Amino acid sequence: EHKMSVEEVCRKYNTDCVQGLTHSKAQEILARDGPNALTPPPTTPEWVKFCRQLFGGFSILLWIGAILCFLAYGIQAGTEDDPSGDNLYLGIVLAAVVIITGCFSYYQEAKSSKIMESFKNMVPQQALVIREGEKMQVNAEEVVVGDLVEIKGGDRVPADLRIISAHGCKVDNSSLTGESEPQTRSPDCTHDNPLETRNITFFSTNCVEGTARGVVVATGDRTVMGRIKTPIAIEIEHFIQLITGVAVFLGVSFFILSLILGYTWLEAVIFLIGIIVANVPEGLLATVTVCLTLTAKRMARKNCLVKNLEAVETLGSTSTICSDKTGTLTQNRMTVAHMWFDNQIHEADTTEDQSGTSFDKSSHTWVALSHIAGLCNRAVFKGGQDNIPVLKRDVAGDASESALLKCIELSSGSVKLMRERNKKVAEIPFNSTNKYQLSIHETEDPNDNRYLLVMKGAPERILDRCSTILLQGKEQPLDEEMKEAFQNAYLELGGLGERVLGFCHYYLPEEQFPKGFAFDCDDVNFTTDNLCFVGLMSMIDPPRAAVPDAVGKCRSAGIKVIMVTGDHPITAKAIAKGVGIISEGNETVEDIAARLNIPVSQVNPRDAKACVIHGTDLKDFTSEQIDEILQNHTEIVFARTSPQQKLIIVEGCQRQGAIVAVTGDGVNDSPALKKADIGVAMGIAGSDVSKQAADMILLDDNFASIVTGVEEGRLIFDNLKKSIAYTLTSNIPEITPFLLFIMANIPLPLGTITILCIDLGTDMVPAISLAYEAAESDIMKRQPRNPRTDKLVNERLISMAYGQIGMIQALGGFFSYFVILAENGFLPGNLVGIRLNWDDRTVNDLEDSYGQQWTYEQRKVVEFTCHTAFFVSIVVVQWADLIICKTRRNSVFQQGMKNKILIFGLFEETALAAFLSYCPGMDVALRMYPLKPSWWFCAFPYSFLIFVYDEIRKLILRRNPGGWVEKETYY
Amino acid sequence: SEKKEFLGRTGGSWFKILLFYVIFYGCLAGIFIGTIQVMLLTISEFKPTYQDRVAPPGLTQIPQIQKTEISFRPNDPKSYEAYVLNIVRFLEKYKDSAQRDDMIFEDCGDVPSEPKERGDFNHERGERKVCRFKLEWLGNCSGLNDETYGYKEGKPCIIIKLNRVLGFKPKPPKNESLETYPVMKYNPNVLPVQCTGKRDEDKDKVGNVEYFGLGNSPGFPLQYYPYYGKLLQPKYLQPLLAVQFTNLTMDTEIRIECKAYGENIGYSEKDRFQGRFDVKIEVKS
Amino acid sequence: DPFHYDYQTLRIGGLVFAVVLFSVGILLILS
Ligand SMILES: Nc1ncnc2c1ncn2[C@@H]1O[C@H](COP(=O)(O)OP(=O)(O)O)[C@@H](O)[C@H]1O
Ligand code: ALF
């Protein structure tokens, strides 16, 4: 539907192409066609997440081990009678661990996905459909074929449209032709093919620039679209790869050593399985999933949309926050307070009865200003609003034109009837790059039917374009004293922190501009120069209640805050001072010049911390100059910036290696969100493009949510670091016993069954439990982490896990082993070099330190008792390891034992340790024998030692920040 | 790649982390050694704290056989060298010259008697006295004439030995009326020992068995027990029992289980060498 | 002494201890 004229296309659907569609036909046609929802996948991936989770991840290794143990028991049964299983129990427990881990991970993932589904349906799409000649915010899932739909720059197009009126409209497809370059739109067809003609806008194609009005042709799946990593994730993947490589190397080496020692083929393969399963942190995936679900729950607790749950880690690791001025830092609900015309500041008489008579309401200059304000606005009221006060009346359109229209309605009269009186013949919509919006209107009086070009926008651009100024109805050129008085008024208005526009117009001559002239939205044939100035219109811009506290908290977290905006430097500086970007006492170069009465060039740009750099000067700055600005200054406030300059600033801030987050609401902040590491878009005041491009949406529109997001991101990083530190400690006390068995020829202190039991009883439940841990008191006081230096896993963490805590745990296990052997009769002195006779199946005369002789099985019972004691001792020292791993910089006394799941895991691991030994009949199942009560306290001195050591180290960390201890023993 | 000679090998003054690790490991070894010595203070030297894992000791044999079998041919003197060499190497310590008088050993009863008590386990007295055991009691088994111990004309002559247990006094079975199987000349002060076939075809056809014990009674005399320790009783000569199969078949593996019955002797299915032992014996030609 | 002492009762006492710890661990999270 492209070639036919607007009349044909609007009569094919039996709709009014001028006014719209009444609610009569809309309901019935909605019944015929249904809601326009693009088809999702058939239902969903069903029952396959469960199987993928119990099959994928870091479990495949456990499955291989389980099946290998099962076939080892089978081959043991298929050979000479070997009733001692020792493998079927291992297979069952391994399979049970895998199944339980998979089920728990699936349950958590479903818990998170339920919240994610609740969020994606929480914020719906909308469109300004025209019904009964009025635009209302109707859900895009309702819009039917045949109704008139208006598309604004910076919004998502609801469905396929037949363009009937466009004004500079440009469409970003990026999904149907692959060309991300925005394409100009027009009502007139240009090409026969519908995939390239400039009169049809496609489904799910946001309109970046300009406004257009058209009639829908296709809605729903019968539409043109309907037929056709994160750093935390990469760090986790890299760590998993490295740890698996180390584990496979160690397992292979141990298997070869076992073959040289000649245990058996079955014992050697089972030892390989035990070592490889024990040396990998299989609890990492479940811990990450649990952290993600906790983050999703905490985000839902305060209505904050997260697209990818792992972006919260990026938000936690941020170091610079780039904020917009209005719509993000301010409530974006403004009202006119001060004007300026005829060289005088007039306070707004925002009263129905005009109490005060501050300014005349009948002067010719005021009449012209009111005409300009009411005619250039694109704002429109809502239906059935004639029974509502003007201030409380709902207005469609951007906040500036909305406030202007409200002020005109309260002061002048009826804006809608005034617009209908003066016919509008041309429109150039507002642009962030242009910073000025214009329209040409006719004059109702037939005395001089001269076309009126009405302009509004940034006051500096207005002054640059205009040449004369209306003084009490007259027309005089812009004098130097007039310019200086206008300037002084502008600085006075900016000192109040209020947004100020600039208004100007121009009467087009009749001899050169005839009545039947043809204007263009692309060829500028107007006289957009030497216009006549009228006056300014200040507007109260109130900052949000939570903004000052949020900024104070965020800056205290070591996060620099930059306020990049398109407004004037004076207004931006006043807003920054009000919201705390420029703290009181911090002082800029211009302030130094003003205070010392010295030219700015004579002022050294080193005594000033804050800077209010203009935007047009940024065009002349280079990358090195921008880096110098970002380095030399601590509280930077850019102003008068175009979206391309916003992208340039964001990239320059990125070039220092610093994670930068950008928050915005309008279309102008879309490139910054698309480039920044994490983008935040406001919910109610935000545009569709910005929220589509952003990685984070604030539904309730509070700025304090960013602080809690950074809080949760840092918590997610710290919990993962603690889990890694805890689960990596147990590696040494399992490879070390075999190493000392092979080096000193002492009896084996830790069997493969005990190794697997240690893994699944100490590195399984407490590892996930550490994810449930809350946040400490230093999470919002510590400097942001350095991504290039402070990785998730580093040399300091490896040292802490292996050479400091793993060594202590191995020593505790060895002490338990030695005390068991000495109590039964083998003193430590005559143990070195005894492995050759100890393991022999035919030497039943083995002597000990006392002279008594042991048979093979009698001493093997003692060795297995040593194995069980080693397992229990490792559990006991893992108590203290888990306790010290709860907190990173604070003391466990200050942090508190407020985590229920942690005590749960401690008690469960101790109960498993007790039951695995004292259960009758377990001597032949898992070769674990009861140990005497006096043997339960062998590792107690070592547990106290490790707890004391880490408490002392954390005390040193707190009392001496930045010392060598923080440099080399603070993971 | 690994940069060098511009700033240092991934660091500056490297002798900081290494020094810290040296002190840390030194103190860790020190506390480990201190804990070990503190534990060693508690454990008695004259007796162990725990002995339930040395549950009644298991019988063993001097011809320590690697594959629980004895196989050789009388025609080849080499074929049984691995056995007789190991026998004589252990039995050399029982030679009369090695066991001398004068407060190292002591002359001791030629008839089985009650277990001699040598005082308490305290060190109030010095090194305890030791009974002397002579190869003459082993009779024809001992190499008093031919240093072959059999294996030349007759079939092997194994020797049964009970494992030492600290302060353990075995008691012969009471209620000798039944004692399951009957015994010839039942008498106390002797721990009876019987060698017999395991399977039904092995219970018979094994031939006659001659026990070369002490005092014409197959068993261990109790006058030697209890053992008092390597420190308290160095050079302790435990009683030995020699068994010879004078006549039996050839070229057939005969399975013989040598049990020892007593009230303080236990039995385990898991440990086949506790209180008994199985032997597979066959002579080739 | 050879005769076992600390078992057939270490098993019962240890099972009681493990059951107590199991109950305490499984009851804390609920409360
Ligand atoms: N809706 C509008 N109509 C006419 N002029 C506008 C309008 N909005 C802003 N202007 C002017 O454009 C300047 C910059 O606006 P822009 O860059 O688009 O985003 P922002 O004002 O939020 O920084 C502002 O100083 C404002 O005075
Ligand atoms: F101040 Al804005 F988009 F709201 F630049």
Numbering used by the authors:
A (entry chain A): 33 to 260, 271 to 1013
B (entry chain B): 19 to 303
C (entry chain G): 28 to 58
From the primary publication:
P2-type ATPase sodium-potassium pumps (Na+/K+-ATPases) are ion-transporting enzymes that use ATP to transport Na+ and K+ on opposite sides of the lipid bilayer against their electrochemical gradients to maintain ion concentration gradients across the membranes in all animal cells. By utilizing energy from the hydrolysis of a single ATP, the Na+/K+-ATPase pumps three Na+ ions out and two K+ ions into the cell in each transport cycle. In this work, we focused on structural and functional characterization of the human α3 Na+/K+-ATPase that comprises α3, β1 and FXYD6. Here, we determined the cryo-EM structures of the human Na+/K+-ATPase in five intermediate states during its transport cycle, including the cytoplasmic side-open (E1), AMPPCP-bound cytoplasmic side-open (E1•ATP), ADP-AlF4− trapped Na+-occluded (E1•P-ADP), BeF3− trapped exoplasmic side-open (E2P) and MgF42− trapped K+-occluded (E2•Pi) states.
We trapped the human α3 Na+/K+-ATPase in its Na+-occluded state using a buffer containing Na+ and ADP in conjunction of AlF4−, and its K+-occluded state using K+ and MgF42− (see Methods for more details). As anticipated, in the presence of Na+ and ADP in conjunction of AlF4−, the human α3 Na+/K+-ATPase is trapped in the Na+-occluded state (E1•P-ADP). The single-particle cryo-EM analysis yielded 3.7-Å-resolution Na+-occluded and 4.1-Å-resolution K+-occluded maps. The transmembrane helices M1–M6 adopt a typical occluded conformation as seen in the pig ortholog. Despite the strong densities of all the helices in the TMDs, except Q920, other highly conserved cation-binding residues, including E324 (M4), N773 and E776 (M5), D801 and D805 (M6) are poorly resolved in the occluded-state cryo-EM maps due to radiation damage. Nevertheless, we can model the binding cavity and bound cations reliably using the coordinates from the previously determined occluded structures of the pig Na+/K+-ATPase. In the Na+-occluded state, F90 and L93 are localized in close proximity to T286 (M3) (10.2 and 9.9 Å Cα–Cα distances, respectively), closing the Na+ entry pathway from the cytoplasm. While F90 residues acts at the first gating latch that regulates Na+ access into the transmembrane region between M1 and M3 helices, L93 situates right next to the Na+ binding sites, serving as a second gating latch and supporting the M3 helix in the Na+-occluded state. Superposition of the cytoplasmic domains in the E1•ATP and E1•P-ADP states by the P domain showed that a helix formed by residues 708-717 of the P domain rotates about ~14o closer to the N domain in the E1•P-ADP compared to that in E1•ATP state. This rotation creates a hydrogen bond between residue N710 and the gamma phosphate group of the ATP molecule which may facilitate the autophosphorylation reaction of the human α3.
